[PDB]
Amino acid sequence: SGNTGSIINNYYMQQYQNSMDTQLGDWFSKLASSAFSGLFGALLA
Amino acid sequence: SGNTGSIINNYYMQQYQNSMDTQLGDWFSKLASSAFSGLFGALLA
Amino acid sequence: FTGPTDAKARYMIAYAPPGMEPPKTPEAAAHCIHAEWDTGLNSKFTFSIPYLSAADYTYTASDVAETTNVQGWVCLFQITHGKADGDALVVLASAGKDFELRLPVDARTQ
Amino acid sequence: DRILTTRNGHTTSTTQSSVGVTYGYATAEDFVSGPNTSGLETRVAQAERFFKTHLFDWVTSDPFGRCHLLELPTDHKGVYGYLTDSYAYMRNGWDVEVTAVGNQFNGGCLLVAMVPELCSIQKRELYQLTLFPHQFINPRTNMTAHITVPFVGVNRYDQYKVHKPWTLVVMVVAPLTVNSEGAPQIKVYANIAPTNVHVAGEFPSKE
Amino acid sequence: DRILTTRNGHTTSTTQSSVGVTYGYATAEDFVSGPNTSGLETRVAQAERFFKTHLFDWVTSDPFGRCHLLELPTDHKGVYGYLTDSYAYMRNGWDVEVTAVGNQFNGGCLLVAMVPELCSIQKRELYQLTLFPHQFINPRTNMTAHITVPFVGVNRYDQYKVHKPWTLVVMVVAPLTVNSEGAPQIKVYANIAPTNVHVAGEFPSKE
Amino acid sequence: TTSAGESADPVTATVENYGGETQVQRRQHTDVSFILDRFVKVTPKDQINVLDLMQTPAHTLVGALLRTATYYFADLEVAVKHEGNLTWVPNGAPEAALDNTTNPTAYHKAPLTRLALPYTAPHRVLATVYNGESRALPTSFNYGAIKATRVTELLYRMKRAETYCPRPLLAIHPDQARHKQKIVAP
Amino acid sequence: TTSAGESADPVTATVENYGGETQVQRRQHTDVSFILDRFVKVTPKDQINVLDLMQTPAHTLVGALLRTATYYFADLEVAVKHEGNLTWVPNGAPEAALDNTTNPTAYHKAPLTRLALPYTAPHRVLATVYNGESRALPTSFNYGAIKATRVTELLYRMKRAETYCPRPLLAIHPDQARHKQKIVAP
């Protein structure tokens, strides 16, 4: 969530604290998890 | 509600905070929403 | 349009987006997002200026040093008129359907 | 009861004195998917807007038959005329709209006509210009005439550098009769627009 | 088992030595229907084809880091570059394809990279060009590198006359080592193509 | 959109009339209760200051934007930096009652003392202009008066603000093609 | 792991390829929202300071690590030690609006005044580099400006930070066999 460390709720609501984001109608975690491993040829023990 | 940003309830009740309003027994939002649009004659594409 | 019943004219209004010089003839301004109307029984015409921009919000204060005005021009012409000499076209401006402002400041009332 | 405001693409044209649109020769377009192009055609939707032009100044000394013949397509210095120098084969319709703004106290009338393949006319031939897609303009009734025609032609796609299929013709049937209370000189303008252009065959670049 | 022939529009590009296409930063396009344009955008499908360009001549005397930076879009003298002078706001992706044809007896390699907003680089910064969408070319394995990137940018539509978002970068990692049986000098070409351009806002004509 | 040009009913020829569509528009920053409840500086006198809202200047934000309304209702809270003791007095008391401390004083707590006042006017709604005596406002159009030894800077803000009957609002007149001022930049 | 050497798809030849196994790895201290929301010092001018994040130095932690991103989105909160009164101004207001107190001033409370600012830029995402005019950034890439009588030390931190499109990050060049510096020791 960030560098917060409070278990209590915030005093100011949500919109006097941050700037509200708006939807309209991530990558490198998908890129680093599709990494090839193992070998390329027939391995032995 | 105004420019408040607190989720907690107020400390002073309601009548030591504001002046209480009294009923007895709006316009430009109704005026701007009755605005004519579209065209006036037979349109084409 | 506030002319008499015998004076007829037709007009056009075009939106020239920024990037080159604004058009000076109605032939050159035919290639904008334009609109034409002529004076008849209903004597009022309302044209909604489109909001075209790169960014999502544009500054309501034109820059002090930067003198190119890179938000846009709006041009209105006459195309022809019949016996409409000395006659007027009073114009007005209103907020649009989806016009909304943002971030209030106090920059002292010029 | 009247819808009298046309638009093509992102340009509109509102007239309040429209007697009506005349669909010439067809109400719908031909099959654009020909066998003489092998399916390599494509619609350019960005060519459909108006473009204004000047025709002549109808004055009181003009007799019967002062005609004006401008061949469509003319010099379009915008998006449509870029396609003429960048594609070899193209087809389109037209929906013309001429304006003759005077006032309701002038007299006379001028016929407007879209006529295909028009060259070498006579003034004795002008009596039968009514056969084409036509629409009269007199200042006592209207100010505009709005004609719409499809692509006619010897074959489905055309080379516009060597051929001009249509010809907007305005001729004056009755002379302009100004009065004490009319307008002395009227000027005839026109905004023309293509309909559903289809280009085929990319030219090489001039560089 | 290999489909190794790409095409964009009516132009194709067959290579037989493709190690694979690298989709940089996204596999799919952003929402083109923004609120900063009021729905007045439109796709021009006729801008999607290749256009060739020359980059440099990779010779044997070039050390590490002889880089080349051409800003996209460059001077397109065809259909795509007509849209730059006729529309104000436009966005597009790219799918570049550089070719370095020698033979399988040359050595060395040159890295190819699509990098956004690239200016004021160092040669000490060249060690980490791998972070961008990149694809190596060495003559021992392949001849081409085929990179594809979407529209990145500070905001959804761009003014290309005052801004160039992408920069095709080729630098040489190992020098060209000719042999008794290799090719002396190779020339680096590239055919670049836009993907799904969207223009918004017609300029007035220059006339 | 062609209209009846003189009936003065609202018409909004939207951007769909020549192709396109409209977006969702948010108007929180132009709300009349949000834009008016922030602090504004007024010039103080030495000791006695009637808490009229029409002594806010005409160049400031919520002084030039309060004069947009003909009739307004708003509870006032002030914030005053002073020395001594500051006695607030309600509407229409004699001005000799500023010295008495039974009236709601605030003792000096450094640096400033902010306190919330009620709407004490007799009228149902106050007003920004009034043609009654030809300053040119009644003595009832005030929230009261504050008196200290020497006030230095006292600030107004007006909350739960209701406005009625709009008046014209003026921006300053350019002498150039467009009023270009030096905007902030790195 | 033998691979296709030029396809530039990710390959991770793990330590199981020659016997052994991998352990559970935790990456909280390298998160982009955790590593960027801490205070950093920038040098101030005397009075007017545009709150651009690219005036953070290139040797510090979150200045050299903010330049890792091409495009960034982050809400800024500042902490400034000053004297006088410090007026914050949003993005793109005229710089004559720094003097007015209706803009969000913070009165002097000893020793310093920290306050949370929203993302006021017009753009969807800001950027750290821009080739538009050949400094070399638009005037829209700022969070606004603060103006006091004399600011002494003003500190930035950036929270809810989202970054896009990484750029190269450089460590300093050793002249020895390895860059040996004096580490802390009892």
Side-chain angles (χ1 to χ4, degrees), chain F residues 1-111:
Chain F
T1 301
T2 302
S3 64
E6 293 85 10
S7 67
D9 50 353
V11 56
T12 58
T14 186
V15 304
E16 294 184 356
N17 294 319
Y18 55 95
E21 63 189 4
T22 63
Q23 280 70 240
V24 54
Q25 46 90 31
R26 294 178 179 89
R27 296 176 186 269
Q28 291 91 18
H29 289 285
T30 61
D31 192 3
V32 73
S33 178
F34 180 77
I35 204 66
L36 292 176
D37 51 0
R38 56 176 54 87
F39 285 100
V40 64
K41 186 260 291 180
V42 300
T43 176
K45 269 77 73 176
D46 288 329
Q47 294 181 357
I48 297 171
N49 297 115
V50 290
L51 296 178
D52 175 68
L53 282 177
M54 295 297 292
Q55 71 186 357
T56 62
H59 63 88
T60 186
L61 198 149
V62 300
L65 195 64
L66 174 58
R67 290 177 175 88
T68 313
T70 314
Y71 298 104
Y72 71 100
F73 169 73
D75 286 329
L76 182 70
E77 65 175 1
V78 299
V80 47
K81 181 173 173 64
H82 65 280
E83 68 268 18
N85 294 318
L86 179 133
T87 77
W88 178 69
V89 160
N91 204 169
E95 300 294 327
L98 289 166
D99 295 331
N100 294 110
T101 62
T102 309
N103 302 113
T105 77
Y107 284 90
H108 180 71
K109 187 175 178 66

Side-chain angles (χ1 to χ4, degrees), chain D:
Chain D
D1 294 333
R2 293 174 66 187
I3 297 169
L4 47 47
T5 71
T6 183
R7 69 103 182 269
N8 288 318
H10 294 289
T11 59
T12 68
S13 174
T14 292
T15 181
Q16 299 180 2
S17 299
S18 178
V19 66
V21 54
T22 65
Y23 290 156
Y25 286 166
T27 61
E29 289 287 327
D30 195 0
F31 296 95
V32 304
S33 67
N36 59 0
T37 185
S38 69
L40 272 71
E41 75 272 14
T42 179
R43 181 179 293 175
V44 179
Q46 287 82 19
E48 301 174 357
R49 77 264 308 281
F50 291 98
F51 64 98
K52 269 75 69 177
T53 185
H54 176 63
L55 270 67
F56 69 109
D57 299 332
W58 176 37
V59 302
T60 183
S61 67
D62 292 331
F64 180 81
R66 189 263 179 94
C67 59
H68 190 277
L69 281 73
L70 63 90
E71 308 295 330
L72 292 172
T74 184
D75 287 333
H76 190 277
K77 295 187 289 292
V79 181
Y80 177 73
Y82 185 77
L83 271 62
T84 303
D85 204 4
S86 180
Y87 287 94
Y89 304 98
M90 62 183 293
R91 73 189 299 277
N92 50 358
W94 297 99
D95 51 354
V96 303
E97 183 183 3
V98 295
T99 66
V101 286
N103 51 4
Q104 63 269 17
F105 289 152
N106 290 118
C109 67
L110 77 163
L111 191 149
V112 183
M114 288 294 285
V115 45
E117 299 290 332
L118 192 67
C119 63
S120 293
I121 72 167
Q122 294 87 19
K123 72 181 293 294
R124 192 259 180 89
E125 183 269 331
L126 293 175
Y127 289 159
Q128 291 180 353
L129 196 64
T130 306
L131 296 177
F132 303 109
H134 71 285
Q135 197 177 9
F136 290 94
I137 292 175
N138 49 2
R140 179 253 177 83
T141 298
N142 54 4
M143 294 189 292
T144 63
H146 193 272
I147 311 168
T148 303
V149 287
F151 182 75
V152 301
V154 178
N155 47 12
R156 296 190 187 276
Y157 286 92
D158 196 358
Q159 295 180 357
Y160 281 160
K161 296 187 266 76
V162 301
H163 182 268
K164 263 68 182 299
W166 286 98
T167 299
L168 180 61
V169 169
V170 286
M171 65 173 288
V172 286
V173 173
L176 182 62
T177 64
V178 305
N179 293 318
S180 300
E181 66 273 16
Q185 177 188 3
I186 70 101
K187 292 187 176 182
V188 175
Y189 292 154
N191 45 4
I192 317 296
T195 53
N196 59 16
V197 311
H198 287 85
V199 295
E202 298 178 353
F203 277 117
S205 66
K206 189 265 298 295
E207 291 182 355

Side-chain angles (χ1 to χ4, degrees), chain E residues 89-100:
Chain E
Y89 304 98
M90 62 183 293
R91 73 189 299 277
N92 50 358
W94 297 99
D95 51 354
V96 303
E97 183 183 3
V98 295
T99 66

Side-chain angles (χ1 to χ4, degrees), chain C residues 91-105:
Chain C
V91 315
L92 287 82
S94 174
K97 184 67 66 67
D98 54 355
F99 188 76
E100 195 172 7
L101 289 91
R102 180 178 166 87
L103 296 176
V105 294

Side-chain angles (χ1 to χ4, degrees), chain C residues 47-60:
Chain C
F47 176 74
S48 66
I49 294 296
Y51 175 70
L52 295 172
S53 176
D56 196 76
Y57 288 134
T58 54
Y59 295 106
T60 190

Side-chain angles (χ1 to χ4, degrees), chain B residues 13-39:
Chain B
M13 292 188 287
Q14 194 172 6
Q15 58 189 357
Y16 293 100
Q17 182 61 256
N18 294 115
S19 67
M20 296 183 288
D21 289 330
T22 299
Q23 296 295 324
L24 184 60
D26 187 73
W27 173 253
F28 282 94
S29 178
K30 293 191 290 184
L31 186 63
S33 294
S34 70
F36 287 96
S37 176
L39 276 302

Side-chain angles (χ1 to χ4, degrees), chain E residues 15 28-29 34 37 44 58 64 68 71-73 84 106 109 119 126-127 136 138 150 153 165 174 183 195 205:
Chain E
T15 181
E29 289 287 327
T37 185
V44 179
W58 176 37
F64 180 81
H68 190 277
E71 308 295 330
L72 292 172
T84 303
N106 290 118
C109 67
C119 63
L126 293 175
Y127 289 159
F136 290 94
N138 49 2
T195 53
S205 66

Side-chain angles (χ1 to χ4, degrees), chain E residues 27-102:
Chain E
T27 61
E29 289 287 327
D30 195 0
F31 296 95
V32 304
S33 67
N36 59 0
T37 185
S38 69
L40 272 71
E41 75 272 14
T42 179
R43 181 179 293 175
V44 179
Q46 287 82 19
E48 301 174 357
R49 77 264 308 281
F50 291 98
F51 64 98
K52 269 75 69 177
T53 185
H54 176 63
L55 270 67
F56 69 109
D57 299 332
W58 176 37
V59 302
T60 183
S61 67
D62 292 331
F64 180 81
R66 189 263 179 94
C67 59
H68 190 277
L69 281 73
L70 63 90
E71 308 295 330
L72 292 172
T74 184
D75 287 333
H76 190 277
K77 295 187 289 292
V79 181
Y80 177 73
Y82 185 77
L83 271 62
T84 303
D85 204 4
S86 180
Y87 287 94
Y89 304 98
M90 62 183 293
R91 73 189 299 277
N92 50 358
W94 297 99
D95 51 354
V96 303
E97 183 183 3
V98 295
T99 66
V101 286

